[PDB]
A paper describes a structure:
Mutations in MAPT, the microtubule-associated protein tau gene, give rise to cases of frontotemporal dementia and parkinsonism linked to chromosome 17 (FTDP-17) with abundant filamentous tau inclusions in brain cells. Missense mutations of residue P301, which are the most common MAPT mutations associated with FTDP-17, give rise to the assembly of mutant four-repeat tau into filamentous inclusions, in the absence of extracellular deposits. These repeats and adjoining sequences constitute the microtubule-binding domains of tau. Part of this sequence also forms the core of assembled tau in neurodegenerative diseases, indicating that the physiological function of microtubule binding and the pathological assembly into amyloid filaments are mutually exclusive.
Two types of tau filaments, each made of a single protofilament, were present. The N-terminal half of the core sequence (residues 273–324) forms the inner side of the V-shaped fold with a sharp bend at the R2-R3 junction, whereas the C-terminal half (residues 325–379) curves around this bend on the outer side. The conformation of the R2-R3 junction in type I P301T filaments is different from that of type II P301T filaments, but it is almost identical to the conformations of the R2-R3 junction in filaments from mouse lines expressing human tau with mutations P301S or P301L. The side chain of T301 is on the outside surface of this common substructure and makes a solvent-mediated interaction with residue S352 of R4. However, in the type I P301T filaments, the substructure from R4 makes interactions with the R2-R3 junction that have an inside-out conformation compared to the CBD and AGD folds.
Author numbering:
A (entry chain C), B (entry chain A), C (entry chain B), D (entry chain D): 273 to 379
Write the structure that this text describes.
Amino acid sequence: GKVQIINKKLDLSNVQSKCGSKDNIKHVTGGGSVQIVYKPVDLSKVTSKCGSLGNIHHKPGGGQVEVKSEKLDFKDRVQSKIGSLDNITHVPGGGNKKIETHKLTFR
Amino acid sequence: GKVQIINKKLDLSNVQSKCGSKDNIKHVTGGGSVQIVYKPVDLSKVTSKCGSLGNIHHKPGGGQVEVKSEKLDFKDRVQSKIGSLDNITHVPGGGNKKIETHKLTFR
Amino acid sequence: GKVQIINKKLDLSNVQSKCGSKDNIKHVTGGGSVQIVYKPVDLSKVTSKCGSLGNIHHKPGGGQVEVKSEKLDFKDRVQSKIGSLDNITHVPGGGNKKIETHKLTFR
Amino acid sequence: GKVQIINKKLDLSNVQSKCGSKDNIKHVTGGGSVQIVYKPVDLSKVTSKCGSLGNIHHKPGGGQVEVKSEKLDFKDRVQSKIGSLDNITHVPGGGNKKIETHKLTFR
């Protein structure tokens, strides 16, 4: 006779909580210019096979992102006023619980 | 006789909570110009096969993104006023729970 | 005799909650110009096969996105006023629960 | 005799909640000009096969998107007023639950 609980599990399991606030580029003040380039991706492919006495000129006018600001003139005040700023993050949650029970009762 | 609970699971399982606030480029103040380029993607392909005494000129006028601001003139005040700013994130939730029970009762 | 519970599962399972607020480019103030280019995608293909004494000029007038602002003149005030700003995120939910029971009762 | 519960499932299953607020380009104030280019896609194809002493000029007048603002003049005030702004997100829901039971009762 055999009365068994057998656990031969292969457990590559993931349990994850991400709770609260995640801010990128918050509260950026510029008197003249604010320039932001966020996560540009370039996956361009260029192939150039040149034969005998051949000529290839790969000369695009610019790259992926070009941002330009010029000739800004301010005569009077440039000002920012904030009376109060509160950045509150309260995380009572984000709890992980993993339970595994094996109970064998024999009579 | 055999009375068995057998667990031979292959557990590559994912449990995940993402709870609360995620802000990118929040509260950006510029007196003259705000320029934002967000996640441009370039997957362009160029192929240039040039034969004998051939000529290829690949010369596009610009790249993917060109942003330009010029000749801005302000005589009087340039101002921003905020009386109060509250950024509140409350996360009581986002809880993960994983339970696994094996119960064998024999008479 | 065999009385069995057998679990030979292949569990590549995904359980995920995404709860709350996600803001991109919120509250952007510009006195002169605001220029935003959001997620441009370029999947253009160019093929240029040039024969003997041939000539190819691939010269498009510009790339994908061109944004331009020029010659803006302000004599009097340029102003923004906000009395109060509240950004509140409350996430009591977003809970994940995964339960797996094996119960064998023998008489 | 065989009394069995057999679970040989191949579980590549997806359970996901996305609950709350998702804002892109919210609350953008520009004194002169606001220029927004949102998710332009270019899948253009150009093929140029040039023979002996041939000539190809691929010269389109511009690329996909061209946005231009020029010569704006403001004599008096340019102003924005908001008395109060509330951005409230409340997510009590967005809960995922996955239950799997195996019950074998033998007499």
